[PDB]
Design a protein around this ligand. Structure first.
Ligand SMILES: [Zn+2]
Lengths: 50, 94, 234, 44
RNA sequence: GUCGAAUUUGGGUAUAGGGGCGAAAGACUAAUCGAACCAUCUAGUAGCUGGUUCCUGCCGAAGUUUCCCUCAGGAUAGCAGAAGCUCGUAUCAGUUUUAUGAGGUAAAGCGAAUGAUUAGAGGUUCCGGGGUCGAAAUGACCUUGACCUAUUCUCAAACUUU
RNA sequence: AGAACUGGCGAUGCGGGAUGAACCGAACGUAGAGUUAAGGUGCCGGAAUACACGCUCAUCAGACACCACAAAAGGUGUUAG
RNA sequence: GUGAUUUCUGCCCAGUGCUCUGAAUGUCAAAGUGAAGAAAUUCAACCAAGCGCGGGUAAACGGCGGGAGUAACUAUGACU
RNA sequence: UUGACAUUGUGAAGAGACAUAGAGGGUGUAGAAUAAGUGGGAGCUUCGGCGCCAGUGAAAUACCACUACCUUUAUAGUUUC
RNA sequence: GAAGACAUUGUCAGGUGGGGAGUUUGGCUGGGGCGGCACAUCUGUUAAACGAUAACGCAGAUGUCCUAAGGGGGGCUCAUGGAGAACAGAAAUCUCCAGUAGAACAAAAGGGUAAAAGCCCCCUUGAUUUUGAUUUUCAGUGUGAAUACAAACCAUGAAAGUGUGGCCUAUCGAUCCUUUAGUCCCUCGGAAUUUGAGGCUAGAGGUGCCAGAAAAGUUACCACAGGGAUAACUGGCUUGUGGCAGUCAAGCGUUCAUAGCGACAUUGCUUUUUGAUUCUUCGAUGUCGGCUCUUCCUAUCAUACCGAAGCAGAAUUCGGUAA
């Protein structure tokens, strides 16, 4: 018997994600003293499409 | 069938060598010890990845068994064996 | 159409009853002919649905399994090999499925489901035909395996079923009382009918020499030495 | 075809056996519904 | 057929054999795919096909028994050849006669058994059915069935005296 | 298709049956003379267009067993009875 | 799995599968424990999951046939 | 996937099981009468408690290889959780 | 920061596990498949007057039953028919006569049997121990079943005598492994004891494919060796069935067997049907039908000349030479 496409989808090599046009990974900023005790300010420069 | 629990029959005993009353019983097999050489061999050959190694018997066609009588001589408590024919029934005449 | 019935038992007691029930229920009033067989009997008919009626009459009373052969509508039936006064014994999976009755049983009466009864304590276990003919056995005994007893005193232990008392009695053999005084401590279940001098028939276990495949499971210190059955005349 | 899938093959397009696979079923069996407590449309 | 789109396409790059890839045909994987190619194990095994090299001389078969997951095959006895050995006309012979036994086939027979079979005639019954006489009959007479008698026609691989 | 006894073909040529694995005769060293088998003697074709008593004339005659086919029923055609 | 849209998607959980927050002693390996024994060993009890019991589940695999009885009579793609 | 051993050390509370002793435990409509029961039972044996039938009676009790039913607490640990 | 001696990891044990691996998936066989057992066996007949003798030949049978349905002995005689006896009748019970077996002998069929081999009763365990020789099947191996003696012990009977399973012919099983009976024997190999194990002699558990492998299917994606020992086509033998024709002629036919037809029977021809068979061809004879085209046959649909009719004419049928 052959291996099914689900069994082939686990090594990758064509089934990877196509990460060329990705702006980046979406992640909250780190837990540091300012966020634990008190707060910190920032500003949106642009809204963008991933 | 029917067989009385008693019968008068030759005794090969060192002292009797005559016809002396015998109590009959049916022969029942034993327990099949685990230290029999042909079981210590099986238990080792089977030990591993080979699988099953010796035959197992499937193609049974009989429907009875032969009956076997264990005859104990009352006055020397020695014993003897007889066999009979295949029978779908066997009881004693006690 | 030919509807035929069969017994595999060394004798016939349920059919000595069947002959009685046919004459009061009257389903043979249409049969072309009634032929005795090697073990039972065959009924002849000319239609199909009346053969369907006679097989349902057969089903109406006794546990059975019924099938259909052809040449002409041949309907065969095998009958349970169980009679009123038997030493019967229920296999292991059958006694857990049915009633949780102990390994020894008795069939005091016959009805649409075969009932079982244990000599020690008092309980009834009714059984349909399907699981039995799924797991066939022959009982360890029949009604022709009996011997006679002779009591001195009776002593009902006070508790009692609708028809049972679990009475303890002191039974004594006829010809032996006059050579030896062999009287045992045996509990009886029908001990409400026994009186100070009458005779009961009983299944002597303590000398009998039986043959079947269910004896290799139990223990040998719980077997009752004696177990009795219903009365003849007194 | 059956080399390619457990559902494959057949002179009709039929699965043959159930689609509710187990959970300890292995790679190569797990094709269909996996630990299905239920199937089907309740009432919609 | 389709021809601005799930379009076509070069180059680079990833996936490598019980593995890849598959808009899925068991299709494609360097003219190779229901499992590529190369070398090695490998002179793979084959109860199966084919072939098997000089002369003359002498002898010369078998396809049959028994067993075998035996039925295109082996073992086994036989058939056959060779080497001879002990002896020298024994006491042997695919033969006849004389004497003495066994057989149950051909034929024959069933007016002999068992079975099968055509015909009538003589009887029998308080007793199988009918009919007339009838109150009835262990009454009478017709009558058909049976059996009984004495014949008659024809038969038997699983009938037989002979 | 399948058995029994024997003989053969197979494994075997030779004369004959035109030819034919098996039939008839007969079994084989190389040659010569003689005689025969089975089969045949009009010519092909070696050998009597021999002798004898008869039958048959067919507008699909008939002519070497195995063998290569032929019936029931008919005919005053003819022959004998 | 099915294969636009529109309109519909019926009754079946007995079977086979899947599942379960369900009762629990019936089964039940190794180890461990106890007993006999000089000991190797033997015997017993306890004993996980799983099996088994009960339940759910069909846009899950799949399946969706027969016989009777309802007054003269008529037995209904009706009811029993 | 489940269990056991190891990796794996340090503690507390407990809940029951094992090994010992203790007794309730026992019981009819009715009786000296607490008894699933019971035999070597004319006797083990004192008042005589008894005594299979003493009497009632479901038991036979008295002595005894005797669970004759124990729900129990207290042990010094083993600790299975 | 969290979790914490739980997880994780390591080793063993149980479960699950066509996702995967390796394998197998009987024979005979009027092709092969289904079926069935002729695959181990028995009786009668095929079987052809010793013996042997075949087929998917015939009629049937076995894989059991028996502590007596074995063994011994003593008495007795059956199936059946006739005559008779209250209820009692075709039939219960009782009595006599005939009665060569026509009854019974577990079971098939055949044989065998009458002071018995059968029916009833009495005593019983020769259905025992030791191992050998022999007959059947047969290689003169086994297995199975049986036969006749020997040495011991027993039963039965007055005794002779008989009895080593069923009156005879069928009714059953190797090596390995396990288990039991026995001398209380041998061994456990440094020497001893006890457990345990192994050995010897006789039995049992079983292979029914019965001289005895441990075994499910599919391929319409397919493969290899080979086979005309073997099917599917032609051809050939056969010709049942099919098709064609003939002979008797009971009758139909308003009367009128036969103008025409013609039952019950019966003789043949044909190979344009279907079948049976399996010789050739499996290292290949290109396999339905139609189109095209030629030739042949006659069992003539038409056309030509004729005969016969229940032919007035007309029209039709039967027949003939003729393709
Ligand atoms: Zn002795």
């Amino acid at each position: 018997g052959r291996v099914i496409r689900n069994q082939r989808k686990g090594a990758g090599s064509i089934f990877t994600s196509h990460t060329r046009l990705r702006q980046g990974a979406a992640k909250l900023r780190t837990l540091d003293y300012a966020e634990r005790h008190g707060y910190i300010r920032g500003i949106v420069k642009q809204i963008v499409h991933d | 069938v029917n067989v009385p629990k008693t019968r008068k029959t030759y005794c090969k005993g060192k002292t009797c060598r005559k016809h002396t009353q015998h109590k009959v019983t049916q022969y029942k097999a034993g327990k099949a010890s685990l230290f029999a050489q042909g079981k210590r061999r099986y238990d080792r050959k089977q030990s591993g990845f080979g699988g099953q190694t010796k035959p197992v018997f499937h193609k049974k066609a009989k429907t009875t068994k032969k009956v076997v009588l264990r005859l104990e001589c009352v006055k020397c408590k020695t014993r003897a064996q007889l066999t009979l024919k295949r029978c779908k029934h066997f009881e004693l005449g006690g | 159409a030919t509807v035929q019935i069969r017994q595999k038992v060394p004798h016939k007691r349920t059919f000595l009853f069947l002959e009685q029930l046919i004459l009061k229920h009257n389903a043979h009033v249409d049969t072309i002919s009634i032929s005795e067989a090697k073990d039972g009997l065959d009924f002849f008919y000319a239609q199909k649905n009346h053969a369907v009626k006679m097989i349902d009459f057969l089903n109406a009373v006794v546990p059975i399994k019924h099938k259909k052969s052809e040449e002409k509508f041949s309907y065969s039936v095998e009958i349970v090999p169980i009679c009123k006064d038997d030493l019967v014994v229920l296999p292991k999976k059958l006694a857990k499925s049915m009633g949780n009755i102990s390994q020894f049983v008795l069939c005091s009466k016959i009805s649409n489901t075969v009932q079982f009864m244990d000599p020690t304590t008092l309980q009834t276990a009714d059984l349909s035909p399907s699981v039995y003919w799924r797991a066939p056995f022959n009982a360890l005994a029949d009604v022709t395996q009996l011997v006679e007893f002779i009591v001195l005193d009776v002593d009902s232990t006070g508790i009692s079923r609708g028809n049972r008392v679990l009475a303890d009695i002191t039974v004594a053999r006829t010809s032996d009382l006059g050579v030896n005084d062999q009287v045992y401590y045996v509990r009886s279940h029908l001990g409400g009918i026994c009186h100070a001098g009458d005779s009961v028939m009983g299944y002597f276990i303590a000398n009998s020499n039986y043959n079947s495949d269910l004896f290799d499971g139990l223990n040998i210190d719980y077997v009752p030495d004696v177990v009795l059955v219903k009365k003849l005349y007194q | 075809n059956p080399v390619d899938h457990p559902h494959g093959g057949g002179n009709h397009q039929h699965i043959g056996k159930a689609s509710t696979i187990s959970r300890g079923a292995v790679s190569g069996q797990k094709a269909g519904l996996i630990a299905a407590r239920r199937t089907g449309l309740l009432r919609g």
